[PDB]
Amino acid sequence: ASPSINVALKAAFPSPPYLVELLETAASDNTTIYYSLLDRIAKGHFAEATTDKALYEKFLEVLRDDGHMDPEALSAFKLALSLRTATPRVEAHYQYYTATVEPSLSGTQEGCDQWFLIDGEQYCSPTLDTSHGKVKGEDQLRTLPFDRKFGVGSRDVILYADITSKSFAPFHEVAMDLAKKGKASYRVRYRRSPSHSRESLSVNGYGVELVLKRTDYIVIADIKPLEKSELAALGMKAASFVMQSEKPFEALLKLTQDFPKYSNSLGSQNVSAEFEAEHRGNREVFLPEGSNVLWLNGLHLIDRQIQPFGLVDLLTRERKLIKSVLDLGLTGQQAVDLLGHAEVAHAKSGDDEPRRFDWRDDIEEGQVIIWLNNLEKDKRYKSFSPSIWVLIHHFGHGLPQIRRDVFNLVVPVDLTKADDVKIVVEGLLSFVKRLIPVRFGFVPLTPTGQAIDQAKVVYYLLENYGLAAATAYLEKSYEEQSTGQPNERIFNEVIKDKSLRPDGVELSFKDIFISEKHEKQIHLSKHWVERLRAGGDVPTVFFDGFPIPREDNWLRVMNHRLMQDLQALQQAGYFGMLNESMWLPGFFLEKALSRRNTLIFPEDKNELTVLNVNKIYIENHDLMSKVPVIEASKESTRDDWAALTVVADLDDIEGQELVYYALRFRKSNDGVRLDIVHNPTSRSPSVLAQRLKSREDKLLDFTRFLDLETALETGEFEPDVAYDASLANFLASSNMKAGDNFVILNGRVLGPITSADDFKKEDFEVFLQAERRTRILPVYKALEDLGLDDKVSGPLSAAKLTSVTALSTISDLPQGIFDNAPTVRTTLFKQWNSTYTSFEVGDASTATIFFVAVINPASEIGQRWVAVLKVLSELEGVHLRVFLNPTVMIEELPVKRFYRYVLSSSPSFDESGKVKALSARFTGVPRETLLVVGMDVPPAWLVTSKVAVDDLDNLRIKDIKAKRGTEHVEAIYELEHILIEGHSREIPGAHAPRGVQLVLETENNPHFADTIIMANLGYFQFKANPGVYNIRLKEGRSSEIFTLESVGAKGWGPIPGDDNTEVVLMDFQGTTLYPRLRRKPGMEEEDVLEPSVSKTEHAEINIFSVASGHLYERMLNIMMASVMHHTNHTVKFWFIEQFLSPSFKDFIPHMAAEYGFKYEMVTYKWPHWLRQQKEKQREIWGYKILFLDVLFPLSLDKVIFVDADQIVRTDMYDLVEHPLDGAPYGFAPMCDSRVEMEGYRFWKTGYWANYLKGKPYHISALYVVDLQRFRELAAGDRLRQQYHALSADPNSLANLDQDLPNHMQFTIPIATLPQEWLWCETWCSDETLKDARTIDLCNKEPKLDRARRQVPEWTKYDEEIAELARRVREEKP
Template sequence: MFRVDFRSAHVHYLNNLEEDAMYRRWRNNINEILVPVFPGQPHYIRKNLYHAVYVLDPATSIDIITSFYENTFPMRFGVILYSAQFIKKIEMSGGELHSSALEHDSEIENDKSSLVNRLRTESAESTDEAVEMHHIEGAFVETELSKAKSSPQEILLKLKKEQTFKEMSQESSLSVFKLGVGTLQCCLLMNGLVFDSSEEALINAMSDELPRIQEQVYYGHINSRTDVLDKFLSENGISRYNPQILADGKVKQRFVSLASSILGGDSVLNEINYLHSPETVDDVKAVTHLLAVDVTSKKGIKLLREGIHYLHACAVYQIGGTKGARVGVLFSASQIADLPSLLLTRTFEITAASYSHKKKVLDFLDQLCSFYEHKYILRSTTAAESNQEFVDKVYELAEANELFSKPYKSSLPEASDLKLRERLNKVSRFLYRQLGIPSGVNAIITNGRVTPLGASVFLSDDLHLLESIEFKHRIKHIVEIIEEVNWQDVDPDMLTSKYISDVIMFVSSSMATRDRSTESARFEILNAEYSAVVVNNENSSIHIDAVVDPLSPPGQKLSSLLRVLAKYAHPSMRIVLNPLSSLGDLPLKNYYRYVVPTMDDFSSTDYTVNGPKAFFANMPLSKTLTMNLDVPEPWLVEPVIAIHDLDNIFLENLGDTRTLQAVFELEALVLTGHCAEKDHGPPRGLQLILGTENTPHLVDTIVMANLGYWQMKVHPGVWHLQLAPGRSSELYFFRDGVDDGSQEKSLSKRIAVNDLRGNVVHLEVVKKKGKEHEKLLISSDVDNQSKDKRGHSSWNSKIFEWASSFIGGRDHSKKSDDCLK
């Protein structure tokens, strides 16, 4: 869980539960948050436990907090104001606007919260009108009239003349941009957690935060003197919010293994020279960022510069250079690269290989990228002049940053266009084939995690965020293991910081490609001194922790599984016994055995079969017993041969018979599923048939009203599920994700039953065109009416025939006589 650290002078709080007079009648005992209340009722405690800070543009929405604030809701409200237009300018310029040191007017600074309140009220009173300049001026004058020492009109003229308030708003907008929440239009920061700005989201955010605060209070981590906001943001605060990096479930992360790409020997990764923060070249780097840069695009050069700023401690960008990561660059080109682009890539290779340890190497590269961007990306120049100008600029910047220009003078003039283009093509093939990154896409590969860059601005702070998240969640544990490795068979000359950093990168990327369960438990905190069974096996690579209630049905099954694992896998094992403290009834009323196939099905002495068997000893003789098989839920198992009544077994009546025999048969598997109608409820009564291609109707079923549930008996194989002839097929057809109008082709579905655990099939049906208002089930009254109509018409036809016989007269009677003869 990550919280956005929004603490700054740009946050303007509207209330303070600990100091404002309107909250003085509330109790200030923090332990009252542990007292149960009615569902939906908050705890009214005079303590700033919940900080609801809205990040909003006052020109679009300012009345979100009204009802909660006026009804003394137990929450501290605040706002961070920004201009959406100004943030759009920052994004268009690539995020290169910076704030300057400004002196704030004291009168305006003291009454800023009152101004925000007045703006909110004005906006609520004139909802039909757009907020204009005269509304702002009127609200300002009315707010300052009773508080300011000088005339509000004079203050307003002073603001217009000095542009102080405009600069302050730009500073606030810039801080919102740096936090990364400017693209969310209007959002809520609940103690740093990002939510939607609606009232429902506010209530849900408070409900989610309540158990976390209660837990901290219960264990004594929060008391009456604790600043809750500072505690939460200090523990889990991040400087910038980026949903693509945080991957909160909405964005799926993609990982690739970098270890497989170096097995061939001639790999692009083996040729990379990395950049480091100053004075950290010889340190082991746990995190490796590989920047896939399109050298012919503006976004690619922007990413390259942000990678340099990420390593460089720079006061202008207000960031500190990272000490635990390194940066490698993979240049490619989405279009034909000109000579300056090729020379830039060659200059980077020379610099990273020869001068990565120099103090000003990052300054040199940043200045060179800035020159290249403004000279060759943003505007076009003549080729002959620009090539020589770029080379001369390299010499000039190298001398200015205390780098010897001799390597550049010996390499750049003689650089071969063909070899440099082959290098770019080789990198492009590697990115596409090994990492799945198409041509022209700028991306970041962090220890195997691939983060493609979209339309949003990517800053050096995002690289810091990516480093901290990946190190905390994945890389930290691998580093701890590698630090303990004894490199006995490795040449000491090879054990450099680069070698170990490469090992960390390759191992962590390979481990990340494995499927990981989202559920985890910390069994090491359990006390195993008096209530655990420990089985040590030093040579085993598998360790099992189990918490078992020994007198429970799940405990019966789990203990049998643990015996099987101990027999065949030989793991080290710790079984923590966790029984109930008190029992009101007999906990177990059955005897359970888990049966698995034996290793040898035939005995070595004769031809008897030693198949799976369950052995029960010391059974009660006078009790009525029942024998059943505990099988997977989709199995339909029934006894086919049984000498005794398996539901009423008396062992004392068996006499000398020591074995109770019964043959069970797996009759079929249960194919289950749910059926839904698009934009409606489940189609109750819909008839489904299942069969093969030659015999379409073998089994059938109908859809239930409860969740559209249906089930059929099947065997393993390939089946065809269809709508039954009649009203089901007349009204409906299956929807295959995309409605392309091919209704007749959607009357059946192919289902493969290839797993003994069963299948759950989700169906969606749509009514045909022109049948949208017809009902599937016809009531009995309508059915009887149709039968009456059919009967009435047949009776009328008989009467008509009888009457026609009289009208036809003799001819008709003669024909009748001839027929009788």
């Protein structure tokens, strides 16, 4: 009965048959479920179900009966089935089939409804008698994302089937059995079924908004009553309403959906019921008022992840993780509590911190570093204060003088090499003389004979005679002899004078081979260099335990850290952490490691691989119950416990050397539990494994290495070929090759080990020390704090937990892209009092999923959150807890829209049994309020209106009732495109390649789409639908400079096996890519700078525009016509697709036939990083200026913008031919001609006249863009980053479209146009219009009035459109 508004969304592809959709949804990624169901339907089991409901009903019984799903999984199936998540996955098959299969399958197809493809041969019969062809085109045997494989087989078989018919069943069975035998491996691909109709797909999982477009007024329903002017209490009173209701869940939804309507209905409470001013004790501790925050098992989610699709994928990943944990007897509640524990999160923060290594002599008994300083005892610094407050009371870029030990620099130097020696002599000494507060040390490098001797020489000379004498030899040697061989002619001269009083123990003189001096000193030195990997082709310098390789300007790097370390000391001083009796260098050495291994501590910080340990001992039980195992000792403690597994090639020296070290390490550490895996031209071998398991008891009784070597040779054994099988499966699961050495401690993998000298006994010790710290100790404390320490029964038992919690903290989203914040699971909201602001839904005891929502009722973002969370709360095995936190800071109206979310937790069915389409229905809509319809769609989606007879930008029920006779409005949108978006990087010095051009292709067409790489995050996007695509760099400069190794389809990575350029989209989340591009031979080149096409493709003239109303669209029709009458040339029109009405959209082919022009619809989705516009008018303006380079195809040389309200009397070519004098775009200035208008000319004021020193204030109603130059100058990137930067201030750009080119005319040239090109009554005189080319209707007479009065021929154009519209309406086929 009530006046209603109904909005529905339909996809750009027809609805796949329901049967196939249920198969796909049902078997998400478990193949066994897939084929086990494929058998069931090939029985003809699902033939007796006539309707979608019946068919859906049948699947529930089947899944439950065959043990496939439990309550939790069944419930998750229903929601995912509602969402229609599997439909794009099925359409991927069809697009692939339509575009690559059909054109590469030459012949005459008759009876070939289904057909196997074997060895590029097609067989239309199960009997497999004859082959129709050698299939043309690329190999189809490529295993791609939507594939499934059944069985292992030398031969590869593919069946393209239309499952719907009965014709399928015999073909399936032919290859199912063939796979069961082992002849070949089976996989199914789809064929668009002609039994089904070409009806479009109805989607859900989006939101609709009804935005009030007049917000200015404030001091069933008619209009919202505006209330004076105590906004401040809205959130607070709104929060109470709910609490009071007692069915609170439903209240919030009912209140939050129609919130603008209930504003004046909240002025009454009656007295606020503010018991909950109590819970700002909650605010005082953790979150600021009016902030929306969601947590999923501790995981802090960003806004983009809060949609139905984003949330379904998170549960799927999360349950897999938790189920892994609860096989150890932990409740979902206990499991989550452990994952988000304080001690756990602390560890992640701890090793987010930068790492230092212990540069000290202490291990080498103070006989390796030869310091040129001592700041506490040098009698140079004697003058200076040895006070801490000297450090703390410092400001500037200068170095504070002090007599204290605080900064150290150790540089390893080769005394054979002149360049190396020069560093010490010139570099190091100046610094000493200069009284710098840094201690300078250096350790010689010993790689050759001469080097060994010269270390001895210098070391000796220091020991007896002193630093000055040693320095003296070095100085003299460098200038005098200029070589790294010891020179006595030079050496003896030094002793002659410098041999005065050599103190301490006396000099022995020449020659040197001291049993102690040569042995201990040189070998101790070698032990220092080896320990910190401070040698080789490129040596490593250590400043405050921070490695800086000896390259480029390392001192510049050192100085940067020197200041950064000083500021680190000062802040500890202001908090009073520091005290007078302290060794200051040890502030840095607190967390420093003794040994530096590039495997444990890779320079790529991200490089980390962890495996699920439980999985390893579950999948390969056959293998791991027969490997030589050294159990960790009977009498050792939980803290000592750790599990190690060594994978090595025992047929190689490196492989068996590595194991000896692991065995040695085990003798020392009684807590470790060791496993040995033989990997293996010999195949397998179970023999070598059997040789060791016999010696298992006697393991680590190997006094010498040959005892291990000999044990491998002796004994006669019978190969356990069952062992061999599980062995090769393990490596395949763990993604590791044959003859490769690896080390696994508590799930963490290091390798491949090329040389066993890289991983020694000392390396295992630090590996355990570091790993222990981070992963094991935080798990142990946390675990015990909860009292779950009963569940740990040994080293292997413990590894399952530690390995799982390490996998929990690895992000889905790379840090720095969507949010800078790390993957830290907080438990910090557990402190909060809950009685009067919280309510829970779902069983906490059973729940695997725990949601914590902190929603502000006054927020528009809250409207969406509530709606989505209610549907996810309906799922079994999910728990939700809600916190309401309003703000007292309300300067403007809080919620200015009505909201509806289209989503169901389980599918709905027709009276006919068909699946119910889901719609957003607003009932009891105010009759007098002007409303705007908006779509709040998931990030990967591109949406436009398809069916509507109303103005969605200007909705009023009273007008529709008075014009149409109906109080009911119905509109349909189309999900036209789904995004392929990615973040590029250059290799190896990873930077965003800007100006790079890309081409998206398909086998049908080699030019689907094209875009250019942006500066910010190497961002790019493509508009596509489900299917198989490829990304080729655009032929030209781009392919000349670069080669793209990969499209990052597997993740940020590189994940092995991703050296691919193929993209496929089979999800409603689109495709997220992280491509990599490496520069071709010796290039520092740039695309942007040099070393009739567009006309032919498009038109002589290319004009683009935008309109946001029926009036503005009516005026746009006139604009196009005026051009046409005024030019005997070819014109193409370009439009911003999503701002136009379907009435306009359905009309243009008719305008195109009449006026003889071509048209193309264009759009681009506003990037996630780029700053949004809440106000639609502002969005529109942004579209005209921010995306000029990326909105139009590369093939377009140039474009012209003409405003909707405009009219043109000129042949528009002239604007093309207008010389731009190397400028990217051309504009027309503001009229000075009107005499008395001055007052309102704001661009002659302080701000605009100071800024525009001499430059004009231009008009955005008309302009030329020399697109080739625009992109070449990379103007867009600059516009975008200046806009983003300026936009932080809300009052920054009054009219951005005009203001951005004007603000950028210093930076980006603007060609100025003759003013013959623009006329506006408001600012130009009437005398001017005789020579006027075009007219804008700039802004109290209305726009319709100005047109008729200002231009006499406006009516002539309007009549032409009017009769044609009627001619079309009266044209019925």
